Symmetry: D3
Subunit: 282 residues, 6 copies
């Protein structure tokens, strides 16, 4: 069977940027097929309706087993609009969001939606005096490094791989929808790292990343004096840069013991595994 | 006037991943509206066809001033189909590809398409023994850092901004379409860096990035013995990691002189410029 | 004209370890004379009582102009006994503590005590499984680098230097006593850094340093399973190491512009200042 | 049995700054109680005499098992006074000092004092044009990191732990007092490092730290021309910084093998040991 | 019982600079005797002819078993004359050169010469505006690091050691003369690295080092505008600096496993081997 | 005129390896011609006398303006033979050596010889258990970076350039001969670094390099237990590696100010100067 899903991207989060690609890293999967639609960075109610409508329009022919809405702050006006529309749709739907989604965790279960809220997927320092396209991409670069090297992306990968296998027995029930909150302590229940210091360095990275959001929030929404708010948002970016360096250090430790976890997909979709560099994944 | 555009994303490149976001870094532009559609990592002809048909169906209602197709290797079977379909459509169109696109540069011109070919946007080590979702993401983080901190995204950003200004006087002649090839020497014609060492560091990072593609191609397409091809593709990833490190050192040099170029969009879409941290974009 | 003071140290904080030394960095001040007493790391009620009694015993002959009590958490049972005893004594007194001291800031004002509360002077990860004497020292080394390179210790230096001038003009009124809370945003009202990026890196280090506190608290007092709390307290120490690296990076940027603020004391206690390596402090 | 000691601190040394805290790193030892007295940075004969009288007064009632005097240059006029007073006293006494102390090593033995001379505990660059309080603290941060991560603090910790055992067993004989000189080669006879390159990095760190002393000495007491002595003392500080870097590198190497030695105290004072991050100290 | 050889050096390459020393690292071999002659950096025909004459003049009394010529580009006019003169001589001879030498590989075989062509021994950025003596020597330091830490020099050592052993049986036929081309992929048939990530980092380093050559050639022989060619040659140097960093990283990874290959010669010239730091080579 | 010199190399030092090359870094000097002869690493009296013979034979027809003998320790038996032979000969001669040469500095002046003694050009750890060819090369790479980037090689370049200009007014009399001792403090009398922190980082590198010599001597000539001398020699290498890192950091500081001093030769021999990257050397 070919399992299918539609991904909807409104606004930008590090996780929503990569979510579809984590499931087919070499485009060699024979068991899945995805369509991806969105309105780029705009996530006002007008644009978000427009984007979900598109997805629902596509869904008529594509017939996906589930839909995913990925974007900042599921509690915001435009994202709230998407949850409602997806709540009302026949389609199982999963919401990927950041820490502010916690305000509506309770609502989302009520609405029968699944969710993955990634606390270290932090808001950047969005002030005109500091944030231009290059700085925005540099931030995302650092953030991607953190969410990848700490193993956060593997948690998301595994959630969706589990969902996809259930879709292959065609019956995704709401009992099957992910309900995950990801943060520093998530690493404590995983077997991601063979070396414990790699693990603690990743935890440190995730803690720093999750602290960034507080700083960005003070600089964009609270501080009104530019002499103070520009330095504040800039410090946020400096923190994320160090978070990335910590995550790289963790990965380098796993390398020093030839113990880097790789979990690639096989053409049939099965998730393989390996630790040693020259061992075949199995 | 509002310039409208549809981005189509099949397979993945550093540039195609950020291209739309580079144009509206704080989602505060009042002069642009975007739709994004794609098939994720799949870029076989059948999926690319579906992808382009999705944009054309959305365009009837949306009325894009131009369409951007973004993805690896414009010469490959899938992208070549996209070029035929877009070349045939009523909408002006731009192809964003990597170095392999050079094989068909003359054709795209003969097709009346624009293009932006980014040579440092290198193909990764796509072998199952090595590239899992986490590795794919780490490679993308490093590559994003390289394209952003060396100023490649700024070159892309300006080319689209020039096109958008022309879309607003509604008449994009095929003469309005970018026809760019970006590589190491692109930095020579720019005033990105105030410090010459930052510039030559960025150049070195782009050189290394472009060299990575040849390593990946040998490991993925030429070498058939896994005992050889797995280390080959891995070595390619170690190179991109060091390019990202050069790119970061360049940026740090610019910070050390309070000379970081920032070119944020104003809400009316105008590109502003500043160098000193506490100076107002203007 | 010779200011005299006693310093009492119960338990350890980065600031309390250095506070006296920061006032006579080459032992060549002829305008000060200090005594230091304490109970080492012990800060239980009976130990603090003993330290304070020690200070008051030698105060009889020494005649200090003021007394400084320095250590962890002023709202804890031990330091609370210190505050009570020092408030009721005849001597002007200042309490040096960390962020937990905020709980009793009003009360200290009511007691007629001065205070300097250093929020980045974060509690370390005190679990036996992890914290041995070497790890304790390594932590203090990183914290000390953070407090110093960011300029936190200058702010401490300046508050004491003003207090001491008042002491010499013999009239330390309650209105003379410091009432400082130091945090990341303290940098915004100072002129420590010539280079703005140095300033924002130092902000980031103070922000991370402050966040180490919560993590330590979680690991030592909240989490009760050692499979979880050991990794938690270790991640706090990795955070602090990286904050120290930010602080270093900020100091290297100042060196790059030959703009390192130095404010040494003259023999008569006047605080001089210089920026350029080769310039004399004046 | 509770062993009791008084620690006397005149002037500053990395080792005397931490000596007492090294013995009770989580403040949970039930077999020791300490008092700490001193005159901060001042160590002329007047101030040392007053610090020792403070210690001897307290000793009347506190009744310590031993007294420790810590600070720079045991052969200097102040510290020489402290040696004469302690040697003539009824209390066993240990002198902690630095390399210059070797000049009176033989005298200290005839005086019946213990010593611990730490050759890497080097004098900093004390010239007004360079050393302000922040610089002073940055140096100590670096030296502390060297003394800690190299195992030097462990060697000191163990010496006092042995002496404490003797004390709880009523027989502090002259023959049980420490007689140590610590340097690079000290590491050759211990088992601090599981990895031999960590050991040799550590050894290099100690050698550099020892050599720093010679540079400071030249800059402070030999060279009289400011155009020469300011760069000299500054260069000594850059050396210590890179010694701290080596020591960090040593520790990271141990982390890579999950072999970090930790020797924390039990509540009853027993020195436990472990190497694996997740194992109980035993 | 002894092997004798003359080394002739015209111009400079990393391999040619170290080639003799690699064979007697402690000056304690009893089974070899060398002479070295050259014309320093000059490798024009007149100079090379003078070099080879000296060698051939020395050879009359010295009776070498073989002669080595080492220098840039075996295919240029000078080196070409050395090849003919040495091939027409009665002495077996080996040419050590860089990648341009591939142009005359078949000519050398037809000449009866051996060769070792090192592709990563890359020409530097030889433009007056940039290359002074200090910059030349820095490039060389970086390049030496690369060729050494990656194991290229060990391949060279082994090639020359095999020839020395055959020469101790006086009969070097042409067929015994090495015929080697060394590049990134040479590592895949070696067992230099115990850790596979050290290996792939080494590969990366050698790839980058080989790419440097193309940059230099462009900057020295193609580009004529100084505003362009000075950035270009400096960029090549930044690349080599990062290759050396990669090679260092690789060697550190091997230290972290106590698995650094060392292959010293015994006094009788036997090539020993060890892996573990403390173990005698056998 | 065309100045001519012959360089004799017996033993290896950093300085003697590069000495001839620092004078014609691009081989485009039309005013010098050099011959180089040596016995490679061997510097016993029999080899040294063979080396000098080669040189004097060639001189007969070559007619050099001066002769230079470079190698380890002028005081040892071989180089002592060189001094006597060169002192007796008709040719003005210069001895290049390390700190141990200071023992015969008086003697060399009596002999009418010039000398350049390089204190930082420190002996490596030559014990067979540690020092193989790759290790020997890695040492030399770090040492070369140190001597180059600190500006020691420039001082050497200058000395020799001066002597060459004297030869072109044809009269290298004995008082034209260099009598240089280079160490850390040499930097104090130079205007090498524009940034004062680069200067002091360089001094620290030179201090550490100089101290390496002592660790080497101890591990090769004093310590007899291999359990000890192996870590000891290896620790000397770790020190050199950090010295190389310090010198690199100094050069990056200069880069950050676009202030890298470059002193290339023009084709007629004139030493030119520049500091700005895009400036023509004059
Ligand atoms: C494209 C970016 N990519 C990301 N990518 C990731 N991974 N994560 C992110 O959070 C983002 N960004 C978060 N985004 C984002 C988040 C918050 C705000 C809100 C703004 O922060 C508030 O509306 C302001 O902070 C106002 O600031 C505005 O007001 C100031 C004065 O100007 P005036 O002269 O007009 O008066 C200026 O700084 C201006 O920017 C905007 C964009 C971006 C759209 C988006
Ligand atoms: C090729 C190297 N390149 C350099 N390059 C630079 N820039 N600087 C240098 O110092 C050197 N090296 C200095 N050189 C150098 C210097 C000193 C010694 C003296 C040796 O250090 C002593 O002679 C030791 O005693 C030998 O130790 C010997 O004894 C041990 C027992 O074995 P056994 O049981 O067989 O007797 C073994 O470690 C062996 O190596 C040797 C070589 C090298 C030839 C030379
Ligand atoms: O008050 P509040 O509603 O809690 O906070 C306001 C913000 O959450 C709201 O403006 C968001 O849309 C800002 N936002 C973005 N706003 C957008 O318009 N586009 C973005 O892509 C975007 C990025 C983003 C990332 C994380 C996050 O938490 C929020 C983000
Ligand atoms: O033979 P050929 O047609 O030249 O194919 C060579 C490759 O360019 C072709 O197989 C591509 O599809 C491989 N490829 C991707 N192939 C895909 O299936 N998905 C991708 O996202 C993708 C990544 C990619 C990136 C850069 C690039 O140059 C090529 C990439
Ligand atoms: O209960 P509570 O009053 O909230 O806090 C419990 C107390 O034991 C705890 O706050 C302190 O004693 C821990 N404490 C230390 N406890 C000690 O006994 N000695 C100390 O040196 C020590 C360090 C320290 C540093 C910061 C800090 O906030 C607290 C520190
Ligand atoms: O003659 P001499 O014995 O070399 O001179 C004695 C010097 O050690 C004398 O100047 C010391 O007081 C300097 N000194 C300190 N002198 C101070 O007054 N206070 C100190 O904290 C201080 C630090 C210090 C550390 C190490 C050291 O070796 C000496 C130190
Ligand atoms: Ca169709
Ligand atoms: Ca001056
Ligand atoms: Ca011979
Ligand atoms: Ca011929
Ligand atoms: Na915007
Ligand atoms: Na008074
Ligand atoms: Na010394």
């Amino acid at each position: 069977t070919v399992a299918k899903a539609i991904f909807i991207k409104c606004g930008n989060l590090g996780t929503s940027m990569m979510m579809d690609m984590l499931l087919d890293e070499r485009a060699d999967r024979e068991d899945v097929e995805f369509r991806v639609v969105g309105t780029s960075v705009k996530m006002d109610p007008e644009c978000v309706e427009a984007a979900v409508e598109m997805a629902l329009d596509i869904a008529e022919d594509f017939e996906p087993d589930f839909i995913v809405y990925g974007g900042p702050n599921p509690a915001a006006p435009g994202p709230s609009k998407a949850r409602e529309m997806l709540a009302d749709s026949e389609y199982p739907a999963v919401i990927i969001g950041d820490a502010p989604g916690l305000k509506v965790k309770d609502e989302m279960e009520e609405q029968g939606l699944g969710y993955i809220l990634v606390k270290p997927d932090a808001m950047l320092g969005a002030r005109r005096e500091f944030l231009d396209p290059v700085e925005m991409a540099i931030y995302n670069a650092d953030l991607m490094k953190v969410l990848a090297a700490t193993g956060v992306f593997r948690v998301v990968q595994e959630a969706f791989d589990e969902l996809i296998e259930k879709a292959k027995e065609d019956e995704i029930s709401e009992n099957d929808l992910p309900k995950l909150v990801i943060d520093r302590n998530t690493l404590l229940e995983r077997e991601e790292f063979e070396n414990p210091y790699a693990m603690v360095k990743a935890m440190a990275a995730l803690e720093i990343a999750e602290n960034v959001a507080d700083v960005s929030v003070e600089g964009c929404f609270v501080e009104q004096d530019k002499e103070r708010y520009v330095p504040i948002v800039a410090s946020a970016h400096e923190m994320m840069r160090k978070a990335a360096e910590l995550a790289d250090e963790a990965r380098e430790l796993e390398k020093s013991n030839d113990a880097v976890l790789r979990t690639p997909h096989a053409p049939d979709g099965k998730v393989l595994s390996k630790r040693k560099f020259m061992e075949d994944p199995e």
